Specification:
binds the ligand C/C(=C\COP(=O)(O)OP(=O)(O)O)CS; 12 strands; flat; five-stranded parallel β-sheet; alpha/beta; Cobalt-precorrin-4 Transmethylase, domain 1; 10 helices; four-stranded parallel β-sheet; Rossmann fold; binds iron/sulfur cluster
């Protein structure tokens, strides 16, 4: 059985920075370091950091006075930030710079009382954080997930309207939502394309290339990782069987029995060690040397803040 690896796969720049922020804080200040929300959506990373003394909380009211609190890479609402700010907490912010860029646009529209529409999935923390930058009652901030949601939305002033997106969406589905927004609201303003980041775009392109060759695709990533679920969905829509797995224990032998080509990729929050263990289990089940596919080169790095070197 041949094993192909997607390229790029695995950690993006925002995840590598966020994990280093929690590790460096643990190193500088000792346990406990409080973290608002799982720092990235990956059980192995999160379990690791917990066992080293990070404590993951959903609400600032769970954190003690005098503590160090880190916001997760997915970002937080102004309400959460202000609630931390008014408490006796030392705060470090691991929000990815590419999420912060969208937050600033939302805040600018709020200041103007001009309405804004976010394309994203209800309840996800990045959506809570982004919708949470808008606060002007004169204006409005609306969430749409699909074309049908666009078809039902009505706004106060469709002449002064902009749109933003979640950074980890399906490139193809978001394209359809934007086409709907422009047909319903011809004066709507947005970025040239969307706010989907380089890493989500790149991993989706790499999985499309992988699934062209492979009969079965394994995506390493946790169940609550949105971007990892998009990679599995992409391969499934191409007619391949595709499974989202946390680690090599999750592989069922029936999934690869008599499969001639199996592909492996990893979401933006999954460490490479998990991919190595998956490759080792596929070898136990018959596969040969893993072959990396040629892929778009990534070169962006985001540094930790100097207070945490
Ligand atoms: C921090 C982010 C993504 C890195 O991957 P993740 O699995 O932690 O998060 P989602 O794909 O947003 O669920 C959201 S920008
Ligand atoms: S998925 Fe994109 S926006 Fe999110 S942390 Fe990674 S680089 Fe940043």
């Amino acid at each position: 059985m041949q094993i192909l690896l997607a390229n790029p796969r695995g950690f993006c720049a925002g995840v590598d920075r966020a994990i280093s922020i929690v590790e460096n804080a643990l190193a500088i200040y000792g346990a406990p370091i409080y973290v608002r929300h799982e720092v990235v959506h990956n059980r192995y990373v999160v379990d690791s950091l917990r066992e080293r003394g990070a404590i993951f909380i959903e609400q600032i009211s769970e954190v003690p006075d005098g503590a160090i609190l880190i916001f997760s890479a997915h970002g937080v609402s102004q309400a959460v930030r202000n609630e931390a700010k008014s408490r006796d907490l030392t705060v470090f912010d691991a929000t990815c710079p590419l999420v912060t860029k969208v937050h600033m646009e939302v805040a600018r529209a709020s200041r103007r009382g001009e309405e804004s529409i976010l394309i994203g999935h209800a309840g996800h923390p990045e959506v809570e954080g982004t919708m949470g930058q808008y606060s002007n009652p004169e204006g409005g901030m609306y969430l749409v997930e699909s074309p049908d949601d666009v078809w039902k939305l009505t706004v106060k002033n469709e002449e002064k309207l902009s749109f933003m997106t979640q950074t980890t969406l399906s490139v193809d589905d978001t394209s359809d939502v934007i086409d709907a927004l422009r047909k319903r609201f011809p004066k709507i303003v947005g970025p040239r394309k969307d706010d989907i980041c380089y890493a989500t775009t790149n991993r989706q392109e790499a999985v499309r290339a992988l699934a062209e060759q492979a009969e079965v695709v394994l995506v390493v990533g946790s169940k609550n990782s949105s971007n990892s679920n998009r990679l599995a969905e992409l391969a499934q829509r191409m007619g391949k069987r595709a499974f989202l797995i946390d680690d090599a224990k999750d592989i069922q032998e029936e999934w690869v029995k008599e499969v001639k080509c199996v592909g492996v990729t990893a979401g933006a929050s999954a460490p490479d060690i998990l991919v190595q263990n998956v490759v080792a289990r596929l070898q136990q089940l018959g596969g040969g040397e893993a072959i990396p596919l040629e892929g778009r080169e990534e070169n962006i790095v985001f540094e930790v803040p100097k207070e945490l070197r």
